[PDB]
């Protein structure tokens, strides 16, 4: 198998505007949201068909009542982050928690905080303690390694239950997540080169120019991958064109073990 | 999912003990002992998550997770540690599976 | 600093009448539980409640119900007593449901015995 992912996202409100919420949780595999969860519905529900065939009403109903907990959990200590840090206004708090399965076997699994969108607190489950950005980071951070039974328990989570969880929905949504669509590719002049490619999936895809068989990464521009809208994506790199001396140019793609050249005559 | 413990044990004062405690279950996120005294409510002894010893006066609680079992373990005895022994499990869902309790007799 | 404060200790009851059991806590805790304890089996939840405004069965809540008054309160409502709800029960409480270790704070107990 590729390498895949499983992730948690919370995100907590202080004054939202009327309508918003001041609470939502989002979890996903790989690039496809799983579940969802906020403050509106109070209800965690599945995103994706595959979760929502292989998981008893029991599920949701246990998870929505966890996911209460969490949010009235984030409610208090963005309160007290923003009083930490004698700030007015709406202010944001953010969780993600999560987990990687490799292609060689190996794993990695992560916790981290931010408030405001930056980077606030980070977990090291080898050293068992967190980095903390600031002064109001520091003071949770003496909080919470001193509960050392909470820090096991998030190792735990993070190498065991957290990786058998995602091999759980990848077997869910193998279906999906274990296909392979190839791209289509394609050069076009507009003075530069583009090599496009559409129609892919999964989304990681390298594609670079060479020069006379040689790489200059500085000189080519490279595309953001794109989502399509029906669950491929896209994507594109350009080089510029030199007027004054010829050269052979080649588009070099790989996707899912493949590799692709396009010589530009 | 099951949580196994013996019903009953009897040791001499000022010896040893072990209480076992074996679990099957679809997850595990740690394992609790508690202590009941005879009409009294479960009181907080000891948690293990990952593999290990933890020591705690003359009480210590052992975890091995490959093999799906943990101990508490009694030093010095005295007629006060008399009590039930409890053990739990944290399942994948963060639900309590209780074990039946054992029933510690010490001999004076 | 009372702890978990449940009540009444003792309470019999004939088949088919109305109890409600009480239970508060003042440890500013979140969760809040209600489980029953019979010989030969370990302690079965009735009814939780995550956090103060929700509440959910546990695996016995037939026969049962709930009520999270407020944060500190949570009350076990038998409309119409049974002889198989003759138990002990116990409302314990912990400061949230997210605390992978958490540990549960309980309360003294209440035995309950139903004759027709």
């Known amino acids: 198998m590729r390498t895949h992912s499983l992730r948690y996202f919370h995100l907590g409100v202080s004054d939202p505007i009327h309508g918003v919420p001041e609470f939502i949780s989002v979890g996903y595999v790989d690039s496809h949201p799983i579940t969802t969860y906020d403050s509106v519905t109070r209800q965690k529900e599945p995103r994706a068909p595959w979760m929502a065939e292989n998981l008893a009403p029991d599920h949701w109903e246990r998870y929505t009542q966890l996911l209460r907990g969490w949010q009235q959990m984030f409610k208090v200590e963005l309160k007290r982050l923003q009083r930490h840090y004698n700030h007015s206004g709406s202010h944001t708090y953010q969780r993600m928690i999560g987990c990687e399965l490799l292609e060689d076997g190996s794993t990695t699994g992560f916790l981290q905080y931010a408030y405001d969108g930056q980077d606030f607190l980070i977990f090291n489950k080898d050293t068992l303690s967190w980095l903390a950005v600031d002064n109001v980071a520091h003071t949770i951070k003496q909080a919470w390694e001193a509960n050392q039974h909470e820090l096991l328990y998030q190792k735990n989570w993070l190498e065991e239950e957290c990786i058998a969880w995602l091999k759980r929905f990848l077997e869910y949504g193998k279906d999906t997540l274990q296909r392979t669509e190839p791209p289509l590719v394609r050069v076009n002049r507009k003075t530069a080169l583009f090599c496009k490619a559409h129609g892919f999936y999964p989304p990681e895809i390298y594609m670079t120019w060479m020069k006379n068989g040689e790489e200059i990464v500085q000189e080519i521009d490279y595309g953001d991958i794109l989502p399509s809208g029906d669950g491929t994506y896209q994507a594109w790199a350009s080089i510029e064109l030199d007027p004054q001396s010829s050269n052979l140019y080649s588009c070099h793609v790989e996707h899912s073990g493949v590799h692709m050249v396009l010589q530009v005559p | 999912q099951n949580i196994d413990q013996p019903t009953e044990m009897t040791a001499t004062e000022g010896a040893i003990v072990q209480i076992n405690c074996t679990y099957q279950?679809?997850?595990?996120?740690?394992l609790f002992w508690y202590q009941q005294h005879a009409g009294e409510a479960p009181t907080f002894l000891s948690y293990?998550?990952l593999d290990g010893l933890e020591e705690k006066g003359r009480f210590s609680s052992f975890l091995s997770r490959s093999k799906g079992y943990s101990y508490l373990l009694l030093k010095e005895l005295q007629m006060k540690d008399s009590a039930s022994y409890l053990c739990?499990?944290?399942?994948?869902?963060?639900?309590?599976?209780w074990g039946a309790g054992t029933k510690l007799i010490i001999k004076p | 600093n009372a702890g978990v404060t449940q009540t009444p200790k003792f309470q019999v009851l004939k088949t088919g009448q109305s109890m409600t059991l009480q239970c508060a806590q003042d440890?500013?805790?979140?969760?809040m539980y209600w489980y029953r304890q019979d010989p030969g089996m370990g302690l079965r939840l009735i009814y939780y409640?995550?956090?103060?405004?929700?509440?959910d069965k546990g695996e016995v809540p037939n026969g049962y119900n709930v009520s999270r008054l407020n944060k500190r309160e949570f009350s076990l409502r038998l409309e119409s007593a049974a002889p198989s709800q003759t138990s002990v029960y116990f409302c314990?409480?912990?400061?949230?449901?997210?605390?992978?270790?958490?540990?549960?704070?309980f309360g003294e107990g209440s035995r309950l015995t139903v004759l027709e």
């Open positions: 739990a499990v944290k399942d994948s869902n963060y639900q309590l599976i």
């Open positions: 279950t679809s997850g595990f996120n740690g």
């Open positions: 293990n998550v």
């Open positions: 440890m500013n805790h979140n969760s």
């Open positions: 409640s995550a956090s103060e405004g929700t509440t």
């Open positions: 314990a409480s912990s400061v949230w449901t997210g605390e992978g270790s958490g540990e549960l704070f």
